[PDB]
Amino acid sequence: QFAKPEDAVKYRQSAGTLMASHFGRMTPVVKGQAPYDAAQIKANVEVLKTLSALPWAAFGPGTEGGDARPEIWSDAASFKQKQQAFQDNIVKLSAAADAGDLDKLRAAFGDVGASCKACHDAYRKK
Amino acid sequence: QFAKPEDAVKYRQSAGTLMASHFGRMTPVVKGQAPYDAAQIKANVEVLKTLSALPWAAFGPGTEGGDARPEIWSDAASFKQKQQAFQDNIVKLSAAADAGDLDKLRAAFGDVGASCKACHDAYRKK
Ligand code: HEC
Ligand code: HEC
């Protein structure tokens, strides 16, 4: 869907921006510094679920650039494993939210955050 | 969810970027220059549905900036009418996609595009 590689870069960076907001806005809730409303979090995690599937298709043929490290395309299976595992972690966060289980949410939230960081550490330029 | 107004601006601009990609990537389909696969379009319009609800909450208290015109906050009801009408048009696009009706999709797509433009013309700085 991208006329030029720059358009893929702009897309995936914007998807990252929105994921960071929908993930990070729950930090005060997970820490107990903001109240826990199960319906609010369920709805927010649904948004995050949708967003979480979006970046990967924007690292397609010839879309090199931005802060993507070149190791993304040459090791296609290792990068894939990481995005599929991140989305696995998102499924677990969805389950916690959908159940209205705050302890479960805390734990799942930490696992998601670790998955974001693991990918950035390997595949995003400093 | 925004620490500073700049963070709201960055969010809403990224939501716009993603909407433009998910809406605009269907142009060749609506024009018949790319094939119509009803399931593909149904899934894409579902993504667009989710995204289409996101910008509005990022024009909240004290989030003035970017290319938002100041008329957005002082005429809160007129701006609201426009975003709710745009989302009405999105519901109609969803219906067309969900039905697998290409003629209906064409018409609904044009109505959505007109709604984007009407809001930008009134509320987005040149
Ligand atoms: C690999 C499987 C990743 C996972 C999982 C997550 N991110 Fe990511 N992210 C990744 C790359 C390779 C890049 C660079 C893209 C480019 O071309 O520059 C990014 C970028 C971001 C950004 C910065 C966007 C920008 O302003 O330029 C953000 C804010 C971001 N990513 C957030 C984010 C979050 C919150 C994630 C987990 C919920 C997450 N990413 C996972 C690769 C991967
Ligand atoms: C008002 C009810 C709007 C509707 C409907 C749509 N958009 Fe919008 N858009 C609006 C404003 C006020 C702004 C400016 C935000 C800012 O603070 O700068 C925007 C911006 C965009 C952008 C540019 C983002 C950027 O790169 O800075 C894009 C690409 C965009 N909008 C796209 C878009 C599409 C495709 C829409 C219909 C599907 C749509 N917008 C509707 C206000 C409104």
Q: What is the DSSP string of chain A?
A: --SSHHHHHHHHHHHHHHHHHHHHTTHHHHTTSS---HHHHHHHHHHHHHHHTSGGGGS-TT---TTB-THHHHTHHHHHHHHHHHHHHHHHHHHHHHHT-HHHHHHHHHHHHHHHHHHHHHHB--
Give the SS3 label for residue B36.
Answer: coil
In this complex, the residue of A2, A14, A50 whose CB is nearest that of residue B14 is A14
Q: Does residue B119 have a known ligand-binding role?
A: yes
Q: Would you say A116 and A124 are in contact if contact means Cβ atoms under 8 Å apart?
A: no
Residues 6+ positions from B68 with CB-CB distance below 8 Å: B9, B12, B59, B123, B124, B125
The tokens describing B120, both together, are: 């930008």
- Please tell me the distance from the alpha carbon of residue A53 to that of residue A65, in angstroms, as a whole number: 20
- Please tell me the distance from the alpha carbon of residue B74 to that of residue A9, in angstroms, as a whole number: 35
Q: Which of A70, A73, A74, A85 is nearest to A119 (CA)?
A: A85
- Please tell me the distance from the alpha carbon of residue A37 to that of residue A40, in angstroms, as a whole number: 5
Domain extents in chain A: 2-126
C-beta neighbour count of A3 within 10 angstroms: 8
The tokens describing B11, both together, are: 């969010």
- Please report, for residues A24, A52, B96, the alpha-carbon distance to residue A30 in angstroms, rounded to integers and kept in the order given: 10, 19, 40
Query: Is B18 close to A54, i.e. CB distance below 8 A?
Result: yes
Q: Would you say A46 and A68 are in contact if contact means Cβ atoms under 8 Å apart?
A: no
- Please tell me the distance from the alpha carbon of residue B111 to that of residue B92, in angstroms, as a whole number: 9
The CATH number of the domain covering residues in B2-126: 1.20.120.10
Experimental approach taken: X-ray
Q: Which of A39, A42, A28, A30 is nearest to A111 (CA)?
A: A30
- DSSP type of residue B68: B
Residue B4 φ then ψ, to 5°: -135, 160
**Residue B53: CB within 6 Å of ligand 2?**
no
* Ramachandran sector of residue A32 (left: φ over 0; alpha: ψ -120 to 50; beta: rest): left
Q: Would you say B106 and B55 are in contact if contact means Cβ atoms under 8 Å apart?
A: no
- The ligand minimizing its distance to the Cα of B113 is 2
Instruction: Give distance in angstroms: CA of A106 to centre of ligand 2.
Output: 34
**Largest distance between two CA atoms of chain A:** 45
- Please tell me the distance from the alpha carbon of residue B80 to that of residue B77, in angstroms, as a whole number: 5
**Residue B83: CB within 6 Å of ligand 2?**
yes
Q: Which of the listed residues A14, A67, A69, A92 should we mutate to test ligand 1's pocket, taking the one with most ligand atoms within 8 A of CB?
A: A67
CA angle, corner B55, sides to B34 and B67, nearest 5? 95
In the numeric block, the tokens 């975003």 are attached to: B83
Helix, strand, coil percentages, rounded to 5, for chain B: 75, 0, 25
- Please tell me the distance from the alpha carbon of residue A70 to that of residue A3, in angstroms, as a whole number: 21
Chain A interface, Cβ < 8 Å to B: 1-2, 7, 10-11, 13-15, 17-18, 21, 24-25, 47, 50, 54
- Please tell me the distance from the alpha carbon of residue A73 to that of residue A78, in angstroms, as a whole number: 9
Q: Which residues of A touch B56 (CB under 8 A)?
A: none
In this complex, the residue of A14, A25, A47 whose CB is nearest that of residue B18 is A14
Q: Which of the listed residues B19, B25, B115 should we mutate to test ligand 2's pocket, taking the one with most ligand atoms within 8 A of CB?
A: B19
